[PDB]
Paper text:
Here, we report two crystal structures of this novel protein family, a circularly permuted [name] (with the GxHxxE motif) from [name] (PIBO) and an [name]-like protein (with a variant GxxxxE motif) from Psychrobacter arcticus 273-4 (IPPA). The PIBO monomer is a V-shaped, all helical structure consisting of two domains, D1 (residues 33–90 and 244–384) and D2 (residues 91–243), with molecular dimensions of 73 Å×55 Å×42 Å. The functional site of PIBO is likely located at the domain interface and supported by the clustering of conserved residues, including the buried GxHxxE motif.
The αO-αR insert (defined as the region between αO and αR) of PIBO adopts different conformations in the two crystal forms. However, helix αQ is unwound before residue 361 in crystal form 2, where the peptide changes its direction towards helix αA. The overall conformation of the αD-αF insert in IPPA is structurally more similar to that of crystal form 2 of PIBO.
Residue numbers in the entry: 31 to 384
Protein backbone atom coordinates (compact mmCIF):
# COMPACT_ATOMS: atom_id res chain seq x y z
CA UNK A 1 0.00 0.00 0.00
CA UNK A 2 1.26 3.54 -0.94
CA UNK A 3 1.08 5.83 2.13
CA UNK A 4 0.55 9.50 1.05
CA UNK A 5 0.68 10.68 4.67
CA UNK A 6 -2.14 13.22 4.37
CA UNK A 7 -2.28 15.86 7.11
CA UNK A 8 -3.58 19.42 7.31
CA UNK A 9 -2.53 22.23 9.61
CA UNK A 10 -4.96 22.56 12.52
CA UNK A 11 -5.06 24.36 15.88
CA UNK A 12 -4.33 21.02 17.55
CA UNK A 13 -1.14 20.25 15.55
CA UNK A 14 -0.03 23.87 15.07
CA UNK A 15 2.55 23.93 17.87
CA UNK A 16 4.27 20.76 16.66
CA UNK A 17 4.08 22.07 13.07
CA UNK A 18 5.79 25.34 14.11
CA UNK A 19 8.48 23.63 16.11
CA UNK A 20 9.27 20.98 13.50
CA UNK A 21 9.31 23.50 10.61
CA UNK A 22 11.75 25.55 12.66
CA UNK A 23 13.87 22.48 13.32
CA UNK A 24 14.06 21.50 9.65
CA UNK A 25 14.77 25.09 8.52
CA UNK A 26 17.50 25.42 11.22
CA UNK A 27 19.17 22.27 9.95
CA UNK A 28 19.02 23.59 6.36
CA UNK A 29 20.52 26.93 7.47
CA UNK A 30 23.35 25.21 9.32
CA UNK A 31 24.08 22.82 6.44
CA UNK A 32 24.13 25.55 3.74
CA UNK A 33 26.38 27.75 5.92
CA UNK A 34 28.81 24.92 6.53
CA UNK A 35 28.81 23.95 2.81
CA UNK A 36 29.58 27.53 1.73
CA UNK A 37 32.26 27.99 4.42
CA UNK A 38 33.97 24.71 3.47
CA UNK A 39 34.39 26.05 -0.07
CA UNK A 40 35.02 29.68 0.70
CA UNK A 41 36.89 29.80 3.99
CA UNK A 42 38.27 26.53 5.30
CA UNK A 43 37.94 22.86 4.54
CA UNK A 44 38.53 20.72 7.62
CA UNK A 45 40.50 23.47 9.32
CA UNK A 46 42.86 24.02 6.38
CA UNK A 47 42.72 26.01 3.13
CA UNK A 48 39.30 26.43 1.58
CA UNK A 49 38.04 23.77 -0.81
CA UNK A 50 38.03 26.47 -3.54
CA UNK A 51 41.77 27.00 -2.96
CA UNK A 52 42.37 23.22 -2.91
CA UNK A 53 40.52 22.56 -6.16
CA UNK A 54 42.09 25.50 -8.01
CA UNK A 55 45.59 24.49 -6.89
CA UNK A 56 45.12 20.80 -7.72
CA UNK A 57 48.54 19.92 -6.35
CA UNK A 58 47.98 16.42 -4.95
CA UNK A 59 45.55 13.51 -4.82
CA UNK A 60 42.69 13.34 -5.58
CA UNK A 61 43.26 16.35 -7.91
CA UNK A 62 46.82 16.45 -9.15
CA UNK A 63 46.20 18.26 -12.44
CA UNK A 64 43.75 20.59 -14.09
CA UNK A 65 42.77 17.64 -16.31
CA UNK A 66 41.76 15.66 -13.20
CA UNK A 67 39.63 18.58 -12.04
CA UNK A 68 37.97 18.89 -15.47
CA UNK A 69 37.26 15.16 -15.71
CA UNK A 70 35.50 15.46 -12.32
CA UNK A 71 33.58 18.52 -13.57
CA UNK A 72 32.41 16.70 -16.71
CA UNK A 73 31.67 13.43 -14.86
CA UNK A 74 29.45 15.28 -12.40
CA UNK A 75 27.57 17.05 -15.23
CA UNK A 76 27.00 13.62 -16.83
CA UNK A 77 25.86 12.23 -13.48
CA UNK A 78 23.12 14.79 -12.98
CA UNK A 79 21.92 14.31 -16.57
CA UNK A 80 21.70 10.59 -15.79
CA UNK A 81 19.92 11.15 -12.49
CA UNK A 82 17.34 13.53 -13.94
CA UNK A 83 16.52 11.33 -16.93
CA UNK A 84 16.67 7.87 -15.53
CA UNK A 85 15.70 8.44 -11.86
CA UNK A 86 13.84 11.70 -11.32
CA UNK A 87 11.78 11.31 -14.52
CA UNK A 88 12.44 7.64 -15.31
CA UNK A 89 11.50 6.00 -12.02
CA UNK A 90 7.99 7.46 -11.92
CA UNK A 91 7.59 6.77 -15.65
CA UNK A 92 8.58 3.10 -15.41
CA UNK A 93 6.40 2.55 -12.31
CA UNK A 94 3.45 4.12 -14.14
CA UNK A 95 3.89 2.07 -17.34
CA UNK A 96 4.06 -1.13 -15.22
CA UNK A 97 0.59 -0.28 -13.84
CA UNK A 98 1.93 0.97 -10.46
CA UNK A 99 0.38 4.31 -11.17
CA UNK A 100 -0.28 5.51 -7.62
CA UNK A 101 3.23 4.56 -6.52
CA UNK A 102 4.42 6.56 -9.57
CA UNK A 103 2.50 9.68 -8.62
CA UNK A 104 3.92 9.71 -5.08
CA UNK A 105 7.48 9.05 -6.30
CA UNK A 106 7.80 12.39 -8.13
CA UNK A 107 10.49 14.60 -6.54
CA UNK A 108 9.14 18.14 -5.88
CA UNK A 109 5.50 17.24 -6.62
CA UNK A 110 4.17 18.72 -3.39
CA UNK A 111 4.78 22.18 -4.86
CA UNK A 112 4.17 21.11 -8.52
CA UNK A 113 7.79 22.17 -8.98
CA UNK A 114 9.33 19.02 -10.55
CA UNK A 115 9.62 20.45 -14.07
CA UNK A 116 11.35 23.59 -12.86
CA UNK A 117 13.54 21.64 -10.41
CA UNK A 118 14.81 19.24 -13.06
CA UNK A 119 15.24 22.04 -15.61
CA UNK A 120 17.39 23.93 -13.06
CA UNK A 121 19.45 20.80 -12.68
CA UNK A 122 20.14 20.95 -16.44
CA UNK A 123 21.00 24.66 -16.12
CA UNK A 124 23.61 23.57 -13.58
CA UNK A 125 25.30 21.73 -16.45
CA UNK A 126 24.97 24.83 -18.64
CA UNK A 127 26.62 26.94 -15.94
CA UNK A 128 29.49 24.48 -15.55
CA UNK A 129 30.10 24.34 -19.31
CA UNK A 130 29.75 28.12 -19.85
CA UNK A 131 31.75 29.24 -16.78
CA UNK A 132 28.97 31.54 -15.69
CA UNK A 133 25.56 31.83 -14.03
CA UNK A 134 23.74 34.26 -16.21
CA UNK A 135 23.86 32.44 -19.55
CA UNK A 136 26.97 34.27 -20.84
CA UNK A 137 29.71 31.99 -22.52
CA UNK A 138 32.73 33.11 -20.51
CA UNK A 139 36.12 33.53 -22.16
CA UNK A 140 37.53 31.09 -19.60
CA UNK A 141 35.13 28.17 -20.02
CA UNK A 142 35.13 24.63 -21.33
CA UNK A 143 32.79 25.87 -24.07
CA UNK A 144 35.33 28.42 -25.31
CA UNK A 145 38.16 25.86 -25.22
CA UNK A 146 36.13 23.25 -27.13
CA UNK A 147 34.84 25.91 -29.60
CA UNK A 148 38.46 26.76 -30.47
CA UNK A 149 39.48 23.10 -30.92
CA UNK A 150 36.32 21.53 -32.37
CA UNK A 151 33.51 23.96 -33.02
CA UNK A 152 31.17 21.15 -34.17
CA UNK A 153 31.55 19.33 -30.84
CA UNK A 154 30.91 22.53 -28.87
CA UNK A 155 27.77 23.28 -30.86
CA UNK A 156 26.48 19.74 -30.33
CA UNK A 157 27.05 20.00 -26.54
CA UNK A 158 25.35 23.39 -26.31
CA UNK A 159 22.44 22.10 -28.38
CA UNK A 160 22.11 18.98 -26.20
CA UNK A 161 21.99 21.04 -23.01
CA UNK A 162 19.32 23.24 -24.47
CA UNK A 163 17.34 20.36 -25.86
CA UNK A 164 17.17 18.60 -22.44
CA UNK A 165 16.07 21.78 -20.66
CA UNK A 166 13.39 22.52 -23.24
CA UNK A 167 12.19 18.88 -23.29
CA UNK A 168 11.63 18.95 -19.50
CA UNK A 169 9.78 22.27 -19.79
CA UNK A 170 7.63 20.82 -22.54
CA UNK A 171 6.20 18.22 -20.15
CA UNK A 172 2.70 19.48 -19.40
CA UNK A 173 2.50 21.12 -15.97
CA UNK A 174 2.57 19.37 -13.56
CA UNK A 175 4.73 16.40 -14.45
CA UNK A 176 3.07 14.36 -11.70
CA UNK A 177 -0.26 14.48 -13.63
CA UNK A 178 1.38 13.71 -17.00
CA UNK A 179 3.82 10.94 -16.23
CA UNK A 180 2.97 8.69 -19.25
CA UNK A 181 2.99 11.60 -21.73
CA UNK A 182 4.96 11.57 -24.96
CA UNK A 183 6.71 14.64 -23.58
CA UNK A 184 7.97 12.63 -20.58
CA UNK A 185 9.28 10.48 -23.28
CA UNK A 186 10.74 13.40 -25.22
CA UNK A 187 12.27 14.79 -21.97
CA UNK A 188 13.84 11.41 -21.11
CA UNK A 189 15.13 11.11 -24.70
CA UNK A 190 16.69 14.61 -24.58
CA UNK A 191 18.33 13.95 -21.20
CA UNK A 192 19.78 10.67 -22.53
CA UNK A 193 21.30 12.46 -25.56
CA UNK A 194 22.80 15.10 -23.30
CA UNK A 195 24.13 12.58 -20.86
CA UNK A 196 25.83 10.84 -23.73
CA UNK A 197 27.33 13.96 -25.36
CA UNK A 198 28.92 14.96 -22.02
CA UNK A 199 30.32 11.70 -20.71
CA UNK A 200 31.37 10.29 -24.08
CA UNK A 201 32.12 12.91 -26.76
CA UNK A 202 33.36 15.64 -24.37
CA UNK A 203 35.46 13.86 -21.76
CA UNK A 204 37.23 11.69 -24.37
CA UNK A 205 38.07 14.69 -26.51
CA UNK A 206 39.62 16.58 -23.56
CA UNK A 207 41.48 13.50 -22.26
CA UNK A 208 43.13 12.81 -25.66
CA UNK A 209 46.65 14.39 -25.38
CA UNK A 210 46.73 14.79 -29.15
CA UNK A 211 44.03 17.44 -29.01
CA UNK A 212 46.33 19.75 -27.03
CA UNK A 213 43.66 21.05 -24.61
CA UNK A 214 44.44 19.12 -21.44
CA UNK A 215 47.52 20.88 -20.12
CA UNK A 216 47.43 22.98 -16.97
CA UNK A 217 48.20 25.97 -19.22
CA UNK A 218 44.94 25.41 -21.07
CA UNK A 219 42.74 24.13 -18.24
CA UNK A 220 43.86 26.07 -15.17
CA UNK A 221 41.89 29.19 -16.15
CA UNK A 222 38.85 27.03 -16.85
CA UNK A 223 39.09 25.50 -13.31
CA UNK A 224 39.66 28.87 -11.66
CA UNK A 225 36.71 30.49 -13.43
CA UNK A 226 34.45 27.54 -12.67
CA UNK A 227 35.21 27.69 -8.96
CA UNK A 228 35.18 31.48 -8.60
CA UNK A 229 32.21 32.31 -10.88
CA UNK A 230 30.03 29.20 -10.72
CA UNK A 231 30.55 27.02 -7.66
CA UNK A 232 31.36 29.49 -4.84
CA UNK A 233 28.75 32.08 -5.90
CA UNK A 234 26.08 29.42 -6.14
CA UNK A 235 26.85 28.22 -2.62
CA UNK A 236 26.96 31.86 -1.39
CA UNK A 237 23.47 32.37 -2.84
CA UNK A 238 22.30 29.10 -1.26
CA UNK A 239 23.57 30.20 2.15
CA UNK A 240 21.91 33.62 1.88
CA UNK A 241 18.63 32.20 0.66
CA UNK A 242 18.52 29.37 3.28
CA UNK A 243 19.07 32.18 5.85
CA UNK A 244 16.07 34.03 4.34
CA UNK A 245 14.05 30.83 4.37
CA UNK A 246 14.78 30.34 8.09
CA UNK A 247 13.47 33.86 8.83
CA UNK A 248 10.35 33.26 6.77
CA UNK A 249 9.67 30.04 8.68
CA UNK A 250 10.15 31.79 12.07
CA UNK A 251 7.63 34.53 11.04
CA UNK A 252 5.15 31.84 9.94
CA UNK A 253 5.54 30.11 13.32
CA UNK A 254 5.14 33.40 15.22
CA UNK A 255 2.19 34.76 13.23
CA UNK A 256 0.58 31.95 11.28
CA UNK A 257 -1.73 32.86 8.36
CA UNK A 258 -2.38 32.02 4.72
CA UNK A 259 -0.18 34.95 3.77
CA UNK A 260 2.64 33.69 6.00
CA UNK A 261 2.48 30.26 4.35
CA UNK A 262 2.64 31.93 0.93
CA UNK A 263 5.65 33.97 2.03
CA UNK A 264 7.49 30.88 3.33
CA UNK A 265 6.68 29.04 0.09
CA UNK A 266 8.11 31.96 -1.89
CA UNK A 267 11.24 31.67 0.22
CA UNK A 268 11.39 27.91 -0.41
CA UNK A 269 11.34 28.37 -4.20
CA UNK A 270 13.92 31.15 -3.92
CA UNK A 271 16.27 28.98 -1.84
CA UNK A 272 15.70 25.95 -4.10
CA UNK A 273 17.04 27.73 -7.16
CA UNK A 274 20.74 27.86 -6.22
CA UNK A 275 20.42 24.35 -4.74
CA UNK A 276 18.95 22.94 -7.95
CA UNK A 277 21.50 24.89 -10.02
CA UNK A 278 24.29 23.27 -7.96
CA UNK A 279 23.41 19.67 -8.79
CA UNK A 280 25.97 19.37 -11.63
CA UNK A 281 28.66 19.73 -8.93
CA UNK A 282 27.68 17.15 -6.32
CA UNK A 283 31.30 16.51 -5.36
CA UNK A 284 33.66 17.59 -2.63
CA UNK A 285 32.02 18.91 0.56
CA UNK A 286 28.41 18.36 -0.46
CA UNK A 287 29.23 14.71 -1.33
CA UNK A 288 30.90 14.02 2.07
CA UNK A 289 29.65 13.20 5.56
CA UNK A 290 26.09 12.71 4.26
CA UNK A 291 25.65 16.43 3.57
CA UNK A 292 23.60 15.98 0.38
CA UNK A 293 21.15 13.54 1.95
CA UNK A 294 20.96 15.80 5.03
CA UNK A 295 19.88 18.66 2.77
CA UNK A 296 17.84 16.98 0.06
CA UNK A 297 16.66 13.43 0.61
CA UNK A 298 13.89 12.05 -1.55
CA UNK A 299 11.72 10.03 -0.92
CA UNK A 300 10.79 10.89 2.65
CA UNK A 301 9.45 8.83 5.54
CA UNK A 302 6.17 10.71 5.23
CA UNK A 303 4.36 8.69 7.89
CA UNK A 304 7.19 9.57 10.33
CA UNK A 305 6.60 13.27 9.59
CA UNK A 306 2.90 12.87 10.35
CA UNK A 307 3.78 11.08 13.64
CA UNK A 308 6.09 14.02 14.53
CA UNK A 309 3.33 16.51 13.77
CA UNK A 310 0.91 14.57 15.99
CA UNK A 311 3.42 14.14 18.81
CA UNK A 312 3.05 15.77 22.19
CA UNK A 313 6.85 16.08 22.53
CA UNK A 314 7.20 18.36 19.49
CA UNK A 315 4.06 20.24 20.63
CA UNK A 316 5.53 20.87 24.09
CA UNK A 317 9.10 21.72 23.03
CA UNK A 318 10.61 25.01 24.22
CA UNK A 319 13.72 26.56 22.58
CA UNK A 320 16.98 27.94 24.12
CA UNK A 321 16.89 31.74 24.24
CA UNK A 322 17.96 33.44 20.99
CA UNK A 323 19.43 30.16 19.69
CA UNK A 324 19.12 29.48 15.94
CA UNK A 325 20.51 25.90 16.13
CA UNK A 326 18.26 22.91 15.53
CA UNK A 327 16.70 21.11 18.51
CA UNK A 328 17.25 17.68 16.95
CA UNK A 329 19.73 16.35 14.38
CA UNK A 330 16.93 14.65 12.50
CA UNK A 331 17.13 11.59 10.26
CA UNK A 332 17.82 12.21 6.56
CA UNK A 333 14.36 11.07 5.46
CA UNK A 334 12.51 13.52 7.74
CA UNK A 335 14.66 16.61 7.10
CA UNK A 336 15.91 18.67 4.19
CA UNK A 337 14.28 20.73 1.50
CA UNK A 338 11.56 18.20 0.75
CA UNK A 339 10.46 17.88 4.39
CA UNK A 340 10.05 21.64 4.53
CA UNK A 341 8.26 21.41 1.22
CA UNK A 342 5.82 18.86 2.74
CA UNK A 343 5.23 21.24 5.66
CA UNK A 344 4.59 24.25 3.41
CA UNK A 345 2.67 22.88 0.41
CA UNK A 346 -0.17 20.59 -0.45
CA UNK A 347 -1.16 19.48 -3.97
CA UNK A 348 0.79 22.23 -5.72
CA UNK A 349 -0.35 25.20 -3.58
CA UNK A 350 0.72 26.80 -0.31
CA UNK A 351 -1.00 25.28 2.69
CA UNK A 352 -3.79 27.21 4.38
CA UNK A 353 -4.80 27.61 7.98
CA UNK A 354 -8.21 26.26 9.06
CL1 LIG B 1 5.05 17.94 -10.31
Amino acid sequence: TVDPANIDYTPENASSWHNYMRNVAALLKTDATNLYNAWNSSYKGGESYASLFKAHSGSPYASALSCVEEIVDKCAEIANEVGTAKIGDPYNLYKAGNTEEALYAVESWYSWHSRDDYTNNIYSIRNAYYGSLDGNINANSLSTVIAGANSSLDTKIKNAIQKAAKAIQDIPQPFRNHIPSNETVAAMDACAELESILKNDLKSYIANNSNNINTDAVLNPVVTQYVDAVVVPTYKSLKEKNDALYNAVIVLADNPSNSAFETACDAWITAREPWEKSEAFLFGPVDEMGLDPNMDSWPLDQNAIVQILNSQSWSDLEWSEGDDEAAVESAQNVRGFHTLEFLLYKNGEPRKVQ
